[PDB]
Scaffold this active site. Sequence first.
Site, PDB file in Angstrom:
ATOM      1  N   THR B 157       0.618  -1.339   0.117  1.00  0.00           N
ATOM      2  CA  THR B 157      -0.107  -0.071   0.176  1.00  0.00           C
ATOM      3  C   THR B 157       0.865   1.198  -0.277  1.00  0.00           C
ATOM      4  O   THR B 157       1.722   1.364   0.717  1.00  0.00           O
ATOM      5  CB  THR B 157      -0.942   0.146   1.190  1.00  0.00           C
ATOM      6  OG1 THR B 157      -1.757  -1.024   1.323  1.00  0.00           O
ATOM      7  CG2 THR B 157      -1.878   1.275   1.146  1.00  0.00           C
ATOM      8  N   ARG B 185     -11.200  -9.505  -2.062  1.00  0.00           N
ATOM      9  CA  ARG B 185     -10.638  -9.438  -0.720  1.00  0.00           C
ATOM     10  C   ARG B 185     -10.471  -7.937  -0.727  1.00  0.00           C
ATOM     11  O   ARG B 185     -10.031  -7.301  -1.606  1.00  0.00           O
ATOM     12  CB  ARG B 185      -9.360 -10.078  -0.796  1.00  0.00           C
ATOM     13  CG  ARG B 185      -8.567  -9.980   0.641  1.00  0.00           C
ATOM     14  CD  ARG B 185      -7.413  -8.704   0.558  1.00  0.00           C
ATOM     15  NE  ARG B 185      -6.285  -8.653   1.561  1.00  0.00           N
ATOM     16  CZ  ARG B 185      -5.615  -7.617   1.857  1.00  0.00           C
ATOM     17  NH1 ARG B 185      -5.620  -6.541   0.822  1.00  0.00           N
ATOM     18  NH2 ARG B 185      -4.817  -7.596   2.822  1.00  0.00           N
ATOM     19  N   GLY B 187      -8.677  -4.886   2.130  1.00  0.00           N
ATOM     20  CA  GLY B 187      -7.812  -4.800   3.228  1.00  0.00           C
ATOM     21  C   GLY B 187      -8.183  -3.877   3.971  1.00  0.00           C
ATOM     22  O   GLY B 187      -9.346  -3.466   4.204  1.00  0.00           O
ATOM     23  N   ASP B 188      -7.217  -3.314   4.639  1.00  0.00           N
ATOM     24  CA  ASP B 188      -7.169  -2.061   5.659  1.00  0.00           C
ATOM     25  C   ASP B 188      -7.451  -0.871   4.794  1.00  0.00           C
ATOM     26  O   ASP B 188      -7.831   0.152   5.569  1.00  0.00           O
ATOM     27  CB  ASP B 188      -5.985  -2.149   6.439  1.00  0.00           C
ATOM     28  CG  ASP B 188      -4.588  -1.862   5.545  1.00  0.00           C
ATOM     29  OD1 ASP B 188      -4.561  -2.738   4.620  1.00  0.00           O
ATOM     30  OD2 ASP B 188      -3.804  -1.117   5.681  1.00  0.00           O
ATOM     31  N   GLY B 211      -2.390  -6.225   5.797  1.00  0.00           N
ATOM     32  CA  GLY B 211      -3.634  -5.434   5.765  1.00  0.00           C
ATOM     33  C   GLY B 211      -4.516  -6.155   6.829  1.00  0.00           C
ATOM     34  O   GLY B 211      -5.208  -5.546   7.690  1.00  0.00           O
TER      35      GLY B 211
END
Lengths: 296, 297
Positions: B157, B185, B187-188, B211
């Site tokens: 990221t 999926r 993530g964060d 994540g």
Amino acid sequence: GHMNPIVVVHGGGAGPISKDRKERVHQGMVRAATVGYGILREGGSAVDAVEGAVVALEDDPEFNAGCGSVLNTNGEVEMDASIMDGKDLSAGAVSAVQCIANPIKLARLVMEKTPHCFLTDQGAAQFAAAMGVPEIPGEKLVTERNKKRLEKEKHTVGAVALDCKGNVAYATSTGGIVNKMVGRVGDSPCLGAGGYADNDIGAVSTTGHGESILKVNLARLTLFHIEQGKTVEEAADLSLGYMKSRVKGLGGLIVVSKTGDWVAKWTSTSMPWAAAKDGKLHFGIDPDDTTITDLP
Amino acid sequence: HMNPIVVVHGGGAGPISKDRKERVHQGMVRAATVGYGILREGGSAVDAVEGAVVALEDDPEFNAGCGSVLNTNGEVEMDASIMDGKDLSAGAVSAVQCIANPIKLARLVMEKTPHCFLTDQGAAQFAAAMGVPEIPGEKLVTERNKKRLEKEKHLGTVGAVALDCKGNVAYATSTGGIVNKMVGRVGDSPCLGAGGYADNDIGAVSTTGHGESILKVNLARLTLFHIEQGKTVEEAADLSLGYMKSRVKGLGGLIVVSKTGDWVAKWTSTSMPWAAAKDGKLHFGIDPDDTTITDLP
Ligand code: NA
Ligand code: NA
């Protein structure tokens, strides 16, 4: 020190609810909390207890999650959910899922069957089919009532448990807000916002205006105040007090500490809730209307 | 009024190849200069972080936009979030496809819907209503990534934080996720308080790393909790990353700026490309205490 288990459940932040609806909501809330408590009083887990309590409300047409979900701007139900285990922070969530009965159960399947925490829409659809989750028709989740709400607009449920072993957990599920843009995600599947569970603190589930809850991270904010040594009630008052002042958002939550203490608090007009501890059932909707009954 | 500042990070990941380092270096500089180019105009923290992240998205070297890592179907699915510290206004998108700039889509979410989060199909539909070019998906897929997925079949990221000359803060984060991630999926990166948080009353954080771990510990807002308790930024960064490692066995990194203009870049992974522009200088590193501090024209 084996603890006295407790489950708390909510049927969502609301404006005023009518006398007749209150009574149907009461039956559904008692039923959800009764399912949850049963698992706990037979030595079940906090996670098993929160999932069970929320499946109950998903299936129940009187609550905006699963069947009885609000419809998006386009007349279809799109659902969000998440689950979390307080011992290892293991978590499962889904956004924008459709055509399934129990988003919370798939939120658990994400947690348990995958290396990931959060699946969405077309991907969540595929993973369900793969896990052997059935696909049900649209109208199966659509009620006649929610159609009137949508047209009238045009022109959240949760649970927290503490189990015998001292584990805490949360599950939340929602259809979202009425006439929402396709693909709108709210607070429910975003850990820290829709809920948060941590054995070193406690567990919280929230409800209300999803965007406000996210912006402020209501669930983790409540637990911050608890880590600071404020009571479960004081903590709820600060975090809700903050969402109101900082971002003008209203809602509610439920929280159970690692010491067993619990509370439902809300700045919306109403929030149907029920708790179960020590063979007693605690119910309320409007502030101060709380009752307690023997729950054998 | 406040002295403006932009910090950027690339991915918080493992060791970096010799020749990659140069390309990565130039990338950080590009993004930091854009953000600082925007600030030196008196422009907003929201503008700078968007600009910085936009540059990293466009650069096929970084895991966001063009050059995003590949999922299981050999496809690009992207997440992004951006947040205005003023009143905590925010926007986010997840599992978005065949567009150049997820970060811009999230800003549109913030400023042009009454929501804060759109995903997958609805996000692509909003992208249409906003005239965002639906680009051939194969533009975003690169050979390093095509090849990298073949191997896993048998960077991380990017983000920016900024304090502007009015004292407002912001964060922005964008990603292709993780190599061989399941379909859809998320993530964060588009999750408020995990991938990033911005609050004029405390500071701004953007995160990177595992994540799922970042989501589990609410990494970005956690870091802020400490700053509230009196921690210096690096003390707070050390404490949140510290807890992530001990509690979920996750490695990552973060950039932070506080409301008064204290700032740091810290990580627990092996490396994290990072750059900061402030007081007319540019800072840049990849490895712990390797910082080059040079002049910015
Ligand atoms: Na329901
Ligand atoms: Na890129």
